[PDB]
Amino acid sequence: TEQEDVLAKELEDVNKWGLHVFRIAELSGNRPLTVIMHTIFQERDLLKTFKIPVDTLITYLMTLEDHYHADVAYHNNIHAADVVQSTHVLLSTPALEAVFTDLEILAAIFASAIHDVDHPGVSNQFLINTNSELALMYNDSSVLENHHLAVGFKLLQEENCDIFQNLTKKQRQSLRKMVIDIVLATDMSKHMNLLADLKTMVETKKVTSSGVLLLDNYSDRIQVLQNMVHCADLSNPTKPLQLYRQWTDRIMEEFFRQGDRERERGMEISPMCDKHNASVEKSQVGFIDYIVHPLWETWADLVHPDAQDILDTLEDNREWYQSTIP
Ligand SMILES: CC(C)CC(=O)c1ccc(OC(F)F)c(O[C@H]2CCOC2)c1
Ligand SMILES: [Mg+2]
Ligand SMILES: [Mg+2]
Ligand SMILES: [Zn+2]
Numbered sequence: 001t002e003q004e005d006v007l008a009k010e011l012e013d014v015n016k017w018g019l020h021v022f023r024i025a026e027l028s029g030n031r032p033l034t035v036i037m038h039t040i041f042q043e044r045d046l047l048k049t050f051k052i053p054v055d056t057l058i059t060y061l062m063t064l065e066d067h068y069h070a071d072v073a074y075h076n077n078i079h080a081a082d083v084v085q086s087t088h089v090l091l092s093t094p095a096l097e098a099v100f101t102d103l104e105i106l107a108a109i110f111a112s113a114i115h116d117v118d119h120p121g122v123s124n125q126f127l128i129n130t131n132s133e134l135a136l137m138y139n140d141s142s143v144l145e146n147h148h149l150a151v152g153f154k155l156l157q158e159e160n161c162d163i164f165q166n167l168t169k170k171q172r173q174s175l176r177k178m179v180i181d182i183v184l185a186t187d188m189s190k191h192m193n194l195l196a197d198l199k200t201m202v203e204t205k206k207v208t209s210s211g212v213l214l215l216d217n218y219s220d221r222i223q224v225l226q227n228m229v230h231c232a233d234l235s236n237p238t239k240p241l242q243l244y245r246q247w248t249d250r251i252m253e254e255f256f257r258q259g260d261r262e263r264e265r266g267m268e269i270s271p272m273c274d275k276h277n278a279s280v281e282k283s284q285v286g287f288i289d290y291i292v293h294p295l296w297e298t299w300a301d302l303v304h305p306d307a308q309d310i311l312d313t314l315e316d317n318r319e320w321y322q323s324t325i326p
Helices: 002-011 021-027 032-043 054-066 077-091 102-114 124-129 133-137 143-157 169-184 188-203 218-233 241-265 280-302 308-323
Strands: none
Touching (some): 002 032, 032 077, 054 102, 077 102, 102 143, 102 218, 124 133, 124 143, 124 241, 188 280, 218 280, 241 308
């Protein structure tokens, strides 16, 4: 009850950017995804809205969480929980108030939860270069992201795991399509085109009487949800520094382990994966400058000024990492 009391206290921050997700992972007995998803579903009244039995939700979440690899440093259940919670916060931004339906909200949150499930800790390119079964199955195209979807949906069919059992056929059809569109958009090979389209939307942005974003067709609606989850996936450098540094520690461990496998095969070691020749700090500054800040600056423009503090933190963290180089 004492550890449970402390966990409940920490979960009171579920609506805040910079939640202590690593603390929650420890306090929950390595069940951050289950406890954070359960909390968010309760917070958003999703169990009642979609008639989800609580035991079914918990059973699915525990099984989903189990299919993240405990021995992968970055792409594990803590990352999934973090992306879920970040998406949850982004969904609540004033500029999107009443924009999305309950089904669309469910899609975005569910997509976030499953988006990296059964990740092996190596990149799509590694899987392609090594002639893996995954790459063979998926014809070198969004190899991991296709797999995450297949696993996430497949687990719904396990005993007492169908959390969507009380949705209508049309609701299930719509949800499935939206979730596929969102998770496939987390493939970094799609980033530049996704960002280009987001910029176009910002340039042509329209708002309602209430000052809320106007999205009146599927293409625009799904595009915003795709970029939202993608922003959440790329949110580490926008978090308070003590969180960001832990994420960087973890991704570098994962990258180095891949580089060790490439070194042992006689392959050229991938960028940033050589533990004997890797500038962690320069790499983060480049990551922010070329990928994360261009994305987040554009998201911030879409919802201006809702995300100014997130953007300010990103810029501060970029400055901090840069300062360690000279
Ligand atoms: C974006 C993709 C979906 C996951 C990814 O590759 C990823 C996520 C977070 C990273 O850093 C930090 F925020 F934790 C990261 O750093 C690499 C790249 C630059 O130097 C090392 C890579
Ligand atoms: Mg596992
Ligand atoms: Mg991924
Ligand atoms: Zn991810």
